[PDB]
Design a protein around this nucleic acid. Structure first.
Ligand code: MG
Ligand code: ZN
Lengths: 49, 146, 49, 98, 1105, 49, 97
DNA sequence: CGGCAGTCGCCGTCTACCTCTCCAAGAGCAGCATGCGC
DNA sequence: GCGCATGCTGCTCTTCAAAGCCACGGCGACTGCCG
RNA sequence: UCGGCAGGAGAGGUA
């Protein structure tokens, strides 16, 4: 819901997520940028880090 | 179409009794600041007025209920309180917007999250930074590629 | 649509008043469409990303 | 259509403007000429019911495939079109071809 | 010419002109003259069509009165507006931050019908802002300009559409009023004519026809020629006026119980009234023109009648049929055609008078409602007109219009041309027009009806392309709001000299010839066939025997800034657009000089702008100094004119006036007495003449860059003066009262040496960045309560101090309440040319300065003359602006001087040249009009006649090319290069105002990110599109550092700074604050958002430990 | 010697692809304008007007 | 806090019990701020008791000042003696009739 | 009952930078202050 | 000359009226409405 | 050691 709420239609996605009680695993580029973590690409992946 | 909604309230461990409110939260004060207008007075905050309206309606409703008023007046006050709360959460969704000085619609709690000028696309996906500058570029033919 | 009367003079000899006036009909459209095709390509790019 | 309009009607996959039907089952054709609208129904060269592909307008023309005869044949009643042949002329639909 | 004292500028024009350009500021002054009702407009309206000399305010005051109550016992009326004298002159209002206004009084009478007595007395209705002699307003000390608005005109508008479902045409109408409800007939897919009364669902037109009083018989008898009306007739099922009234009652007023009496009154108090429906004068004139109605008597009333609606329905059915004529019972004849909504015969102009009249009317209506409501709650015999009238709504409306409005705009005073152009602008936006987002692509096009009324070239370049335009030079406005243009009447193939002004709706029934048409001595066309303009802008080649009108001049279709580009017909439209836009951005220089090659418009564009000083009478000059001129008139009176020396304009430039007369000269009325900002001897001069070479040079002028010489810095050729202004305020406080004084117990005595005995700086001191201007302290309560709050020079500023203006309260000066003293300080600097500054020409050339070279490093001619500027040749051919090369050729010919040999008669190429253009002197000034100038045979012949220099050498050959030497190596260049003179202007985009940098500074409050802007020492945005590049490069650490420890991480910013200063390693980023702000935002909408760990147990996310 | 071998990043808007950001090695010049190599104008899409 | 320990972000509907849990007190008076004393009112929308002290280690009265009184609730005012940064993270609630 | 087609309302429409001005109003209610009369 | 009575302008406080007003494409629910 | 600040709307421009 974090990646879809920042694209379009914030109210609808927030309402659907609240009703469904969804959970976000924070495993994408946009979410890692939003919360302030290293993106999982390039030099931010486990082998190189 | 109906099962998509009726099954969400069953598969999880929640209850459908969250759509009806009995207490309203209040944002911390430093997130809705009130500052002086160039050594004069304070000119609106766009969020401290919808709260004032809700509090006024709630106080009047409480005083009228604890007095023995007829049903018509209490019903009118309850309708007005409902409209005020609805305008607090989302202004303009039903009926006409609540305006202020200059016929300018007030900005609600859900208007600070949506749009290209909201929190998501203007404070979380892009920011302003330190150690930066700007100037006009000109051509230098004596330089190298690096 | 094309105008059945042509512009017989080059820019090296100079156009007349009417030729210069009818030259601007399709010279304004270029700029207005250039200005309106830069706002529908950036939304396509944002949707593709 | 051409340009960005088209790019986005091939990305944001939607029904085009002039949808040209495609041949459901390999078979001969039943091209009849009407007043303002043709009405083909194709011949079942498999042994079943003809797919009634009718009510197409006259505005949109007919196409030119690589027919078995070996030329740019314009759909003539009695033509062995194959599964996938764009009968008319106009952008097809990405949901029927699937 | 036609001006008493003017420089002699010879011209290449071959055509004569029967008309002179009008006053260039009469579009602003005429409307205010009409609104005020002054005698000048009264006489002008008495000159022609003297029927109803009604002013602008008088018609409002007469439409208002009388004001009656419900009972009908008393009434109030108004009449006779009149104005007092202006309180303060212009300069006092501009100095003390006041408004330029004059009080207004009206007379009101109170009649009581119960008794019969009358009580009348004069009331005061507030101060009315007034317009100066230049067409501008001074509001709160700032000059303002009100811009005209292009709006659709009230009337009846037909249409035509085709349906994609079926296949047939569908028509419609739209009765648009000035203020009221909208009707809307329309045919349908089947055959049911319907009407949307006030956008309220739909209903067959027969219910309305019945309501109005038409029985089935009458209708069928009248609308029987068509079949759609028969069909609609036999399917209404509402026969009966009362049941049709009920029909539309349960439509327009839902839920309410329908009573025939209310329906009767709802079908009268909507359209057939006088209070809510108003088809204004324009609307009425247009309706009684389309529907061929009673155009035999004056235009009175303003409500919709029945005949109108009937004729509308008739027209609609006759148009659905497909005829081309119609006649209503006892009317005239008219074509049956649909109309366009962008035709300049359907778009009118709302000038300043009609923009102020609307606000006055709104305030009047509010005051009228108040007085009507208060007339019924007071006691009789104590009611007087002064006790019933409230002024507050009117003054509130006036001050709201003249302040926070989209059409009263801040005036731009970069140079006189920009100020003149601002006052001639037609804007399609505003309160009642369009929007930058709603406007499409058909309202931004050059309609064929713009010829002579709007300029097709001068328009903005950004999102406002086509939404803002300029009036043409010969255009003028109707008394209704329609733009006219003049023509010459021709009869029997001979052009006469009688001028008639025609609107766009009257010139489509005549054949109009072209300005560039060969005309003999008697006035007969030479060419057998001429290029004309037919009805629908159709250009054709008709044989010259049908022409009915002719243009007045080739420059009829261009504005005042486009008519200043020589060789305009050789330039593309885009480059001429840029040249016209960039001619308004030039800055005034310390010394001015007129162009060597001009157009002739520059003389009357400077007198009409108003930045010069002209003489109002004839006399001899008695005394001349640097700041005053005394003229003795012939009768005996003496008049003295003062000058503005080093005044600051709206944009920080310098406005300086200098005298150009001697101490014994004889002066004629209308002669220019003093110069101005961008003026040279009475004519506008925005740049300088420089010697050019067209060649590439070592890549320093690569991709639109420019190379300059050092002689342009050592001789102050391109130097300008910029002035700045700073203020501070001394006010009272809850702990005391702020005082301005030199004594400050917080700072040292070394930095308080340039202050006087009052706390202010002294005139003539050189201030710098971070220096002190005034010294002020604030008490904190009662010692040792004094804090420091001093006005200091901002970052990156400097210059001398040239003036101080102090205002005090104790010396009887108007001041805002709560403050005690005011002080203003003016700081001026002189700016030379440098790298990064923007230069331009009149043809679209534009670039920044790449290098400045020593005069010994520059290519030089055969006699040792270096060139001043080098331009690249790769940018000319691909942009189709070849007027600059012709300008350089003609400029060289004018600079050197020429002489045509006539020993064996005048040469064949010089047959059409005048007799004064066969010989010229060095440094001569010529003129080439915009569409009738120097041909190319003439230029080619003049290029081989130029005079030699001191030694008998001709440096530039017949092609305009010269052999240059190389100033770095000494060898000649192998091929000849083009040389000449060109006119170069300096644009107001300087690099000293665009450089910025920051390491740390102020931060925000809610989201603790760096501030924005250069004045607040802000940072630069790292937007969304810039993050995608970082993610595509693979740089995961640069992005993380850019997003956490440089923007939001409050605890990591300080540790990073300490680590950098101490030389240690940079620490690990924390968590941004904006995420916590978002979480509290989500929690305030009753959403239970929590951050879990690997085993539940939600994290606190509040620090504190 | 502080700015020796310390790269900086140069950016021009709009950033339509990767090459809208690049890293250079700074040099001290005289003036108030930035000097750009002639061969990177194609990647930056930057003229000099 | 460490960003390397987050694992989930859950959203859901909030009940009245949660709203009464997050809150530190209930507001009753619609007043906002005193215009003349330039100090927050009592039980308004800008209150030191519900939300937090406006200045560091201070309170409405002057009984406890400087940093030595932390952890003590003022018995006549009710304001906690702690930092002023806690006004960005403490909420309140309104009891609807 | 049952199709149904029009209708209406709600989503979306490129990035970075510079300069300027304007921000509720009215009505009641104070605690004094100045005129008139004996 | 003194005592009584009546109006200065800053300050404070609280919020519906009511006329004023007039893109475009896509999608999906829905709702009277005809049959 | 006292002591100490940064919201909205409209208009015009540059690439
Ligand atoms: Mg450029
Ligand atoms: Zn206390």
């Amino acid at each position: 819901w974090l990646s879809a709420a920042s694209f379009q239609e914030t109210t609808r996605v927030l309402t659907d997520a609240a009703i469904n009680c969804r959970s976000d695993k924070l495993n994408g580029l946009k979410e890692n940028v939003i919360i302030g973590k290293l993106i999982p690409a390039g030099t931010g992946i486990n082998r190189y880090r | 179409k109906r099962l998509k909604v009726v099954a969400a309230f069953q598969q999880s461990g929640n209850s459908p009794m969250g759509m009806v409110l009995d207490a309203v939260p209040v944002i911390p004060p430093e997130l809705r600041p009130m500052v002086q207008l160039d050594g004069g007075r304070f000119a609106t905050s766009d969020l401290n007025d919808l709260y004032r309206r809700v509090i006024n309606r709630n106080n009047r409703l409480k005083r009228l209920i604890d007095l023995g008023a007829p049903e018509i007046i209490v019903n009118n006050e309850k309708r007005m309180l409902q409209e005020s709360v609805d305008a607090l959460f989302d202004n303009g969704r039903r009926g006409r917007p609540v305006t202020g000085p200059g016929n300018r619609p007030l900005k609600s709690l859900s208007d600070l999250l949506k749009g290209k000028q909201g929190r998501f696309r203007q404070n979380l996906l892009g920011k302003r930074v330190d150690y930066s500058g700007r100037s006009v570029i000109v051509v230098g033919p004596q330089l190298k590629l690096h | 649509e094309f105008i059945p009367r042509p512009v017989k003079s080059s820019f090296r000899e100079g156009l007349t008043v009417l030729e210069y006036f009818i030259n601007t009909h399709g010279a304004r459209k270029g700029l207005a469409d250039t200005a309106l095709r830069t706002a529908d390509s950036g939304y396509l790019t944002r949707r593709l990303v | 259509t051409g340009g960005l309009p088209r790019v986005q009607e091939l990305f944001e996959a939607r029904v085009p403007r002039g949808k040209a039907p495609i041949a459901d089952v390999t078979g001969r054709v039943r091209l009849e000429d009407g007043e303002r609208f043709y009405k083909i129904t194709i011949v079942p060269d498999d042994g079943g019911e003809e797919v009634v592909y009718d009510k197409i307008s006259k505005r949109q023309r007919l196409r030119v495939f690589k027919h078995e005869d070996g030329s740019e044949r314009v759909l003539s009643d009695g033509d062995h079109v194959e599964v996938g042949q764009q009968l008319m002329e106009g952008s097809a639909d990405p949901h029927e071809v699937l | 010419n036609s001006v008493p004292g003017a420089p002699n500028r010879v011209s290449f024009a071959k055509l004569r002109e029967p008309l002179e350009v009008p006053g260039l500021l009469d579009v602003q002054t005429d409307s205010f003259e009409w609104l005020i009702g002054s005698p000048r407009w009264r006489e002008s309206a008495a000159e022609r069509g003297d029927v109803n000399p009604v002013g602008g305010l008088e018609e409002v005051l007469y439409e208002l009165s009388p004001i009656e109550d419900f009972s009908g016992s008393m009434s109030l009326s108004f009449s006779d507006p009149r104005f007092d004298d202006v309180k303060a002159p212009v300069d006092e209002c501009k100095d003390k931050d006041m408004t330029y206004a004059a009080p207004l009084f009206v007379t009101a009478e109170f009649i009581n019908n119960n008794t019969g007595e009358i009580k009348s007395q004069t009331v005061f209705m507030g101060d009315f802002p007034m317009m100066t002699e230049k067409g501008t307003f001074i509001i709160n000390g700032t000059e303002r300009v009100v811009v005209s608005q292009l709006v659709r005109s009230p009337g009846v508008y037909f249409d035509e559409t085709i349906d994609k479902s079926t296949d047939k045409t569908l028509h419609s109408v739209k009765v648009i009023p000035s203020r009221g409800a909208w009707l809307e007939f329309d045919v349908d897919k089947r055959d049911t004519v319907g009407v949307r009364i006030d956008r309220k669902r739909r209903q067959p037109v027969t219910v309305l026809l019945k309501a109005l009083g038409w029985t089935s018989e009458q209708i069928v008898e009248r609308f029987g020629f068509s079949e759609i009306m028969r069909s609609t007739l036999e399917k209404d099922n509402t026969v009966g006026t009362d049941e049709a009234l009920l029909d539309i009652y349960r439509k327009l007023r839902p839920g309410e119980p329908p009573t025939k009496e209310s329906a009767q009154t709802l079908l009268e108090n909507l359209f057939f009234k006088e209070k809510r429906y108003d088809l204004a004068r324009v609307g009425r004139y247009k309706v009684n023109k389309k529907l061929g109605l009673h155009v035999g008597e004056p235009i009175t009333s303003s409500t919709l009648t029945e005949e109108d609606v009937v004729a509308t329905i008739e027209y609609l059915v006759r148009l659905h049929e497909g005829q081309t004529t119609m006649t209503v019972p006892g009317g005239v004849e008219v074509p049956v055609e649909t109309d366009d909504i962008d035709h300049f015969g359907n778009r009118r102009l709302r000038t300043v008078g009609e923009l102020i009249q609307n606000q006055i009317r709104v305030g009047m209506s509010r005051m009228e409602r108040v007085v009507r409501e208060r007339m019924t709650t007071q006691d009789v015999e104590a009611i007087t007109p002064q006790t019933l009238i409230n002024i507050r709504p009117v003054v509130a409306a006036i001050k709201e219009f003249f302040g926070t409005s989209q059409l009263s705009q801040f005036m731009d005073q970069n140079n006189p041309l920009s100020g003149l152009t601002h006052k001639r602008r037609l804007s399609a936006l505003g309160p009642g027009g369009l929007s930058r987002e709603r406007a499409g692509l058909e309202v931004r096009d050059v309609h064929p009806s713009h010829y002579g009324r709007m300029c097709p070239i001068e328009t903005p370049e950004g999102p406002n392309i086509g939404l803002i335009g300029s009036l043409s030079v010969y255009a003028r406005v109707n008394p209704f709001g329609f733009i006219e243009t003049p023509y010459r009447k021709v009869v029997d193939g001979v052009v006469s000299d009688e001028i008639v002004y025609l609107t766009a709706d009257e010139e489509d029934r005549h054949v109009v010839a072209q300005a560039n048409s060969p005309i003999d001595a008697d006035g007969r066309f030479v060419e057998p066939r001429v290029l004309v303009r037919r009805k629908a802008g159709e250009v054709e080649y008709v044989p010259s025997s049908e022409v009915d009108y002719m243009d007045v001049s080739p420059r009829q279709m261009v504005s005042v800034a486009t008519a200043m580009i020589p060789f305009l017909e050789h330039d593309d439209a885009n480059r001429a657009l840029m040249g016209a836009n960039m001619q308004r951005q030039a800055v005034p220089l310390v010394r001015s000089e007129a162009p060597l090659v001009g157009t002739g418009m520059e003389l009357r564009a400077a007198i009409d702008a108003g930045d010069v000083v002209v003489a109002e009478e004839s006399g001899v000059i008695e005394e001349v100094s640097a700041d005053y001129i005394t003229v003795m008139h012939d009768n005996g009176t003496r008049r003295t004119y003062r000058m503005r020396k080093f005044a600051r304009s709206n944009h920080g430039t310098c406005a300086n006036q200098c005298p150009i007369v001697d101490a014994g000269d004889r002066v004629e009325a209308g002669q220019v007495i003093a110069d101005g900002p961008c003026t040279d001897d009475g004519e506008m001069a925005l740049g300088k003449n420089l010697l050019v070479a067209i060649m590439p040079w070592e890549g320093h002028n690569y991709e639109d860059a420019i190379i300059l010489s050092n002689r342009l810095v050592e001789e102050d050729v391109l130097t300008s003066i910029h002035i700045e202004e700073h203020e501070i305020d001394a006010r009272d406080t809850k702990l005391g009262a702020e005082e301005i004084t030199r004594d400050i117990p917080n700072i040292s005595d070394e930095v308080l040496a340039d202050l006087d005995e009052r706390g202010i700086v002294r005139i003539g001191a050189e201030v710098r960045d971070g220096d002190i201007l005034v010294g002020k302290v604030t008490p904190k309560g009662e010692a040792r309560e004094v804090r420091d709050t001093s006005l200091k020079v901002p970052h990156g500023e400097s210059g001398k101090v040239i003036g101080i203006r102090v205002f005090s309260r104790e010396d009887e000066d108007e001041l805002p309440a709560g403050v005690n003293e005011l002080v203003r300080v003016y700081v001026a600097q002189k700016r030379k040319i440098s790298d990064g500054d923007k230069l331009a020409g009149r043809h679209g050339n534009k670039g920044v300065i790449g290098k400045i070279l020593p005069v010994e490093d520059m290519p030089f001619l055969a006699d040792g003359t270096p060139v001043d500027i080098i331009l690249n040749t790769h940018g000319v051919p691909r942009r189709m602006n070849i007027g600059q090369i012709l300008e350089t050729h003609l400029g060289w010919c004018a600079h050197s001087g020429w002489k045509v040999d006539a020993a064996k008669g005048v040469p064949d190429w010089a047959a059409r040249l005048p007799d004064e253009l066969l010989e010229a002197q060095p440094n001569a000034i010529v003129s080439t009009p915009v569409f009738d100038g120097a041909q190319e045979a003439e230029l080619q012949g003049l290029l081989s006649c130029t005079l030699p220099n001191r030694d008998g050498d001709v440096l530039v050959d017949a092609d305009g090319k010269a052999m240059l030497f190389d100033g770095r190596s000494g060898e000649p260049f192998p091929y000849p290069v083009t040389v000449g003179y060109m006119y170069i202007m300096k644009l107001h985009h300087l690099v000293d105002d665009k450089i910025h940098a920051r390491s740390t500074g102020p931060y925000s409050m809610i989201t603790q990110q760096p501030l924005g802007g250069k004045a607040q020492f802000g940072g630069q945005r790292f937007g969304e599109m810039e993050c995608w590049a970082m993610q595509a490069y693979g740089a995961a650490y640069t992005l993380q550092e850019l997003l956490t420890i440089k923007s939001d991480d409050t605890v990591g910013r300080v540790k990073v700074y300490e680590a950098i200063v101490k030389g240690e390693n940079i620490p690990e980023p924390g968590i941004p604050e904006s995420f916590k702000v978002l979480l509290k935002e989500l929690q305030s909408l009753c959403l239970n958002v929590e951050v879990l760990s690997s085993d539940g147990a939600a994290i606190e996310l509040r620090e504190g430990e | 010697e502080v700015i020796a071998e310390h790269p900086v990043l140069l950016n021009r808007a709009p950033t339509l692809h990767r090459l809208g950001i690049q890293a250079f090695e700074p040099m001290l010049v005289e003036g108030k304008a930035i000097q750009l190599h002639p061969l990177v104008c194609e990647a930056f899409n930057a003229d000099f007007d | 806090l460490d960003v390397n320990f987050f694992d989930e972000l859950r959203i859901g509907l909030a009940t009245a019990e949660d709203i009464r849990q997050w809150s530190y007190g209930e507001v009753k008076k619609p007043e906002t701020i005193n215009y003349r004393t330039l100090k927050p009112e009592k039980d308004g929308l800008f209150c030191e008791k519900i939300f937090g002290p406006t200045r560091d280690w201070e309170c409405y009265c002057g009984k406890y000042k400087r940093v030595r009184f932390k952890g003590i609730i003022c018995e006549r005012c009710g304001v906690e003696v702690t930092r002023a940064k806690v006004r960005r993270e403490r909420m309140g609630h309104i009891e609807l009739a």
